[PDB]
């Protein structure tokens, strides 16, 4: 009965990078989280501000969905109170977050014959990111006290690099797709409920 759209979110053709993640607002549908086809590559499941057992008995106003692709040894940075490079320059969660974090292996799609270069991530920045902020600036970074004048040199670098995903690798370098859900509840006629 007018199920929520989750087919194109979890079964898309190609995802985006981590510095340009997408954001889709789901509303006016019934939360029916039982048709995720079990996410065959053994998806993980961790919720912080909600309980997995009894969560279908709560009506929320709006539910946001974010999607990106990161490495294997960096999935632990998507959590409240975490430091690093993908938790301070690309994507950061607040201290009181209500939602769940999902991730599964995608080593059979995001890999081609001897080298795949189509995913980037920010390495240099001036200050840390506030929660829920996206930056798509491709300017040059100054690491000294002299102007750069828009040309790479000694103390002026480029803030983006590739990932080099390859099929033959370890269990800590294969790509993992991450989807973050956030629940919202305010003084509105909430319509997004569970199966009931």
């Amino acid at each position, epitope marked *: 009965t007018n199920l929520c759209p989750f087919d194109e979110v979890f079964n898309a053709t190609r995802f985006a990078s981590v510095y340009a993640w997408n954001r889709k607002r789901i509303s006016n549908c019934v939360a029916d989280y039982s048709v995720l086809y079990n996410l065959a590559p053994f998806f993980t499941f961790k919720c912080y501000g909600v309980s997995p057992t009894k969560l279908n008995d709560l009506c929320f106003t709006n539910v946001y969905a974010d999607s990106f692709v990161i490495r294997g040894d960096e999935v632990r940075q998507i959590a409240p109170g975490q430091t690093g490079n993908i938790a301070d320059y690309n994507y950061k969660l607040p201290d009181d977050f209500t939602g769940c974090v999902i991730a599964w292996n995608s080593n059979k799609l995001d890999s081609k014959v001897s080298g795949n270069y189509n995913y980037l991530y920010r*390495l*240099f920045r001036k200050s840390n990111l506030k929660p829920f902020e996206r930056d798509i600036s491709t300017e040059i970074y100054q*690491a*000294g006290n*002299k102007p750069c004048n828009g040309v790479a040199g*000694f103390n002026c*670098y*480029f803030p983006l*690099r590739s990932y080099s995903f390859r099929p033959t690798y370890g269990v800590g370098h294969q790509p993992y797709r991450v989807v973050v859900l956030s629940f919202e509840l305010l003084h509105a006629p909430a319509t997004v409920c569970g199966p009931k």
Partner: antibody
Amino acid sequence: QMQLVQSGPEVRKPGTSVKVSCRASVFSFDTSAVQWVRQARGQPLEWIGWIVFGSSNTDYAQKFRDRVTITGDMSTGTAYMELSSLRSEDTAVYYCAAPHCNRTNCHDGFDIWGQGTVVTVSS
Amino acid sequence: EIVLTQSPGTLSLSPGERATLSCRASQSVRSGYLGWYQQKPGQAPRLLIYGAYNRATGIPDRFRGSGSGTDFTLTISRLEPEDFVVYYCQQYDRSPWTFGQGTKVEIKR
């Protein structure tokens, strides 16, 4: 005092591989850089041979870039330099240089230097 | 590649005087990526002037930097003899970085 420790002397045959290291503590900040210079007896300095730890990007000279390679490692903080197909004209001292850098900002000039490494090619 | 040509090969003076050495270039370089060095024979070179205007830490207040555009010069204030050594210039602005030939200073007698 902030200094850069280097390797010891080594003698090689006419045509082989050689490896010289340059270990330091400031080489683990994702923004550090280090160049390689060479000075013979009497002759002045030679080249640049620089590398940036992080977004690894090499840039060699014209006579080189056919027999030299530079690598980096942030775990131990040690740089490396390899030179294959050695002839009897490379007998000189090799130096290591790097600027003082924080985790977010570097300096504006090469301040710290090294000691030197002697390479000889004979019997 | 940009080439540097230091004109004064040797420059003999007396302790307690003023010497002026220059290090010109062929093309035009940016006055933000020039550096001077000092090297004693049998030791490791150190940094003297970076940015062609700024001095390094610990360097005494007698080495003054000047010059811009295509011609750069280094002036000595008072020769208290501890610095009769070779000086070099470097231009780390383009992709191929080069050095100079060398200027040695000796004592006159």
